[PDB]
Amino acid sequence: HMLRPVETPTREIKKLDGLWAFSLDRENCGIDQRWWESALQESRAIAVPGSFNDQFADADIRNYAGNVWYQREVFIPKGWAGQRIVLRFDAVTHYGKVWVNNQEVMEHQGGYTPFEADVTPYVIAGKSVRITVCVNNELNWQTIPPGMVITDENGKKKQSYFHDFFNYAGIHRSVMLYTTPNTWVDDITVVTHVAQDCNHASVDWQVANGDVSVELRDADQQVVATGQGTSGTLQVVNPHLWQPGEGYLYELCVTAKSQTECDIYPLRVGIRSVAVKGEQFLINHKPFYFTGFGRHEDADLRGKGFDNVLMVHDHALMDWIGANSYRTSHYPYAEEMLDWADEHGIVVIDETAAVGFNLSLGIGFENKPKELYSEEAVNGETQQAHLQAIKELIARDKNHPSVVMWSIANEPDTRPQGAREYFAPLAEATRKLDPTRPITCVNVMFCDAHTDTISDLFDVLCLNRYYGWYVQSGDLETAEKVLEKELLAWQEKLHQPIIITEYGVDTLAGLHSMYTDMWSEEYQCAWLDMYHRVFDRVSAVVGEQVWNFADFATSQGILRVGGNKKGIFTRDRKPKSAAFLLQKRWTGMNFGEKPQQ
Amino acid sequence: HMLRPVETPTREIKKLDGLWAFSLDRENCGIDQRWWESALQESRAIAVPGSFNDQFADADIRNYAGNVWYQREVFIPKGWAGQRIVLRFDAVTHYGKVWVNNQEVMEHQGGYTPFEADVTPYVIAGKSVRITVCVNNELNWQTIPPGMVITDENGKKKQSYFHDFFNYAGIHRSVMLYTTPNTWVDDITVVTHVAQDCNHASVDWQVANGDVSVELRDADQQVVATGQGTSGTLQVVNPHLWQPGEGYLYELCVTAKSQTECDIYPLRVGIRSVAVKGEQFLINHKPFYFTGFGRHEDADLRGKGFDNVLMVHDHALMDWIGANSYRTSHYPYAEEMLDWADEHGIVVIDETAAVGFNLSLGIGFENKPKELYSEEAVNGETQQAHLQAIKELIARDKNHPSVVMWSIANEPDTRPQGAREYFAPLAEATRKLDPTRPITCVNVMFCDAHTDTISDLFDVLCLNRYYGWYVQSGDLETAEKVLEKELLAWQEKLHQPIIITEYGVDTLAGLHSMYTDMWSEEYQCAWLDMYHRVFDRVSAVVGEQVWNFADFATSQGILRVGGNKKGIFTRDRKPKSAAFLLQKRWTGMNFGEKPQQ
Ligand SMILES: CCCCCC[C@@H]1NC[C@@H](O)[C@H](O)[C@H]1C(=O)O
Ligand SMILES: CCCCCC[C@@H]1NC[C@@H](O)[C@H](O)[C@H]1C(=O)O
């Protein structure tokens, strides 16, 4: 049971603020020598939140595999003698184990979701405790995402993985201590139903030794509904709906009264209905059309570290270009992202970190498990770890009205028997963990309409298609034919709504061509344009998401010229020519509505 | 009297073909030691045609001022015992003096026009003579263009000049030996009149001890007119006219019969009428609208050297983009250019090399004659040299139907009294040297409508305007207002047709901006677009020529990031985004007709 921290009977002191002591451990003696005991040797200042790889311009820190130590002292605020205090890590990429002054208090696997522990017994209010963090950036076959650690003859660990983006690690987001009353709200769940768009209710179901009443206050803070019951309610309402263009928010505030002290938790709600009918995706009983991007949490110097200016600027760009939706590509994003999405009515495809369950999308000319689904590779523990990743993503983003669909994985290889054996239970478990949202699994190119094995276990079909790029390279005529043929094949086979969640081409900013050859800005424009002409001719396609909003870092190889260049913007957010192409189509269309051509 | 070499009683052996011996002369002892006597010492292979500056990747050859020696042996063809043979240099940039085996035979000042000498007495037919050329790249106040040589304390000559483009030198074009019969055509002049577009004649006037008859053969080689008379004729005709879109060519062939031997010269003619009426420029009695470029003869490695692939490719680009006209910016171009223009119906503004008669367009923070028009600077000899440059340009391109206007100079400073004193006689002398074409002088920005002194001495007003770039920098709103105000002021003051012969902005390929700030591709697009919206609101503007077709080399300075970047194409001919902007406007308009907005 987890909620995002906020105010009044609750209060934060964040240690996000500032520089920590940081150290490597090339021989992994930190645990043996109990480094959490003393203040570190060999410590250098590092900034949190932020990846550790790019911060020191050193290829050895950058390419490190192992454990790293983050440590900082802090003064525990003194008006906190009688309240309950928690230590919350909003993300520690891959694995983290924390000591609060010689006392292990938490441990976590999963680099993208928050994890907290009550630390009341282990701290002296009014004085300073020392926080030590042990961070592991290693991936094996039971981590979400999977990878393999390669140890050379000399014990240097080098991490290989099967996804594009670079394996940035560290404390990527918020680290804070926050206090709730000893009687406190611990979890909230809100569900919205709507009929003729002027007439429904907000079911609730709450959970910590406190009798609870909930007021549903206005944007004007005018109250229009009231309930009581730990097992919640159905507050019935005639309302203004949370819509894609505007995203209205009521405020449902839950009051947890114990007979002495009280706690109250403010939770914003968007009144909207999501469903799939035939080949139509409907938000509030109207067929929506998705436009926008796959994104990444990547940026210069800070890696995957959260940054407010970046969020403000990237939403300004996305707003300008006319995007209405995005997918949290290949891991759960910072919650600040989803909060922004709620206030602005941005439609979001929420996705777990389950990427790389595929051993066919390689560079060439170089020792893998020859069976993807097996005891050596993706096995039962992997499945359990995956289900737990689904449970953490859902427990954190269930109430967000902007999250409109759950993505279980991205681009697994579905051809082997055992893909369906691995995925079907996860598809079912996910539906039972949130029956109010449709479910998806993003589908790779070579698992075509004929060969794919699991897409009928999901509500929406999300395709990643690169005809004319990785195959039929340079050939816009042939690729157009292939793309039309496979889209009609998919619509014939499943009669589900189709979103093209990935389509894009590597483009060097400033490379121009009078031909329309690959890597050129002219080719990025003509290729996106040919895709758009096809989408507009297939009734089932309800959504387009250009593969990347910006250029991002990847591991080194012959396929990646300083990373992935499929961005519409450069890594410093400057637009390639295709940006204006996109802006013309996406602002020239009626909002949320499929282009009539 | 000069004509371009061609065939049958005439025949070429070109020494353009191939590598010559080349040498510097840092102490100028080549003339004293009569290097033309022997085969050179210290000689390295060099390619002709082509500048010498960029060919060796050496900054000292590149930045040299002085004399250089070109020398090659050649075998004089033996079936040339009884015909007359000439040595023709199509261009030797700035100055050249040639010895044909210890016999000075020619000398020339003027780096852009051909010069030839009969060499019959000085050669043994059937054996090989040695050709030595002395080339000077220096500019003083009596050269077209003017410059000043700066000699430092150690006698190193460094050339300063007052124009943008780099002072490339050498043998830039064709060097050939060609034979005519001892009775030969020596000069031709053709004039075209046309009334209701189905009804007029071709006046002629011919000139070398030969009785002459002229047949006017078809594209089908069908004869439709015939004359005789050294003093020519008026062949009256009902015809298909030389038009801008197509450029039909008759062939007028002149037959020079002596009683024994004969010579005949083929000369293509375009039947078209050019005139100015009010604020209208008419080709064949219809108002034309100019689109296209200022160009340059500049390209990688070869400098200003002529190259056939470059001509084919640049015309393919210009054709694609929709350009119908161009100005031979800042010197006469290769005649092959004007021949191409004739066959393709490209309208050309022909311009002399008289650039830099202005000492106000400088970079800053650095000794010039404080009076531009004076004995120290532009004086009477400069005027005579300028008139001779006008005479050479006109004698070479008079018959070309594509040449539709003569440009006397580019961007002189007209404010001082003495600008009108210098220019008026040249304007008159030019009208009397070709009364069939309108006359222009390209006008610089700071000689505004109020202050300019000489524009009323010319038929067409050609403006070079850079509001929003060099002034009101970045400000599209303010610059738009200024540009409209000055264009209406010019139309009010002179009621002449206005061509904007220069408008452009420096643009780094691949620099992009979400603002529309300078040096960005987005700014090049928005600035050209604002100019186009203004032009379309002023009745007198009949022509637009974006300043540069491609990026070109300039001398070093703080204003030029690796040269001038105002090109629409890069120096390797790849398009910036604005190229598509241009292609949309220029191909979306009715041909030769002003955009109705
Ligand atoms: C032949 C199949 C090619 C799959 C390649 C498409 C990949 N999908 C997942 C994304 O994270 C990658 O960046 C994308 C790519 O490589 O740019
Ligand atoms: C303030 C007046 C500025 C004049 C500058 C305009 C110049 N006209 C002549 C061209 O040869 C130059 O390239 C152009 C420029 O500099 O790019």
From TrEMBL, chains A, B:
Residues 274-591 form the Glycoside hydrolase family 2 catalytic domain. It holds the Pfam family Glyco_hydro_2_C. It comes from the Bacteria. Gene3D superfamilies: Galactose-binding domain-like (2.60.120.260), Glycosidases (3.20.20.80), Immunoglobulins (2.60.40.10). InterPro entries: Beta-gal/glucu_dom_sf (IPR036156), Galactose-bd-like_sf (IPR008979), GH (IPR017853), Glyco_hydro_2 (IPR006101), Glyco_hydro_2_AS (IPR023232), Glyco_hydro_2_cat (IPR006103), Glyco_hydro_2_CS (IPR023230), Glyco_hydro_2_N (IPR006104). Residues 185-272 form the Glycoside hydrolase family 2 immunoglobulin-like beta-sandwich domain. Keywords: Glycosidase, Hydrolase. Residues 13-181 form the Glycosyl hydrolases family 2 sugar binding domain. GO terms for biological process: carbohydrate metabolic process; glucuronoside catabolic process. Belongs to the glycosyl hydrolase 2 family. This is Beta-glucuronidase. It comes from Escherichia coli. The lineage of its organism: Bacteria, Pseudomonadati, Pseudomonadota, Gammaproteobacteria, Enterobacterales.
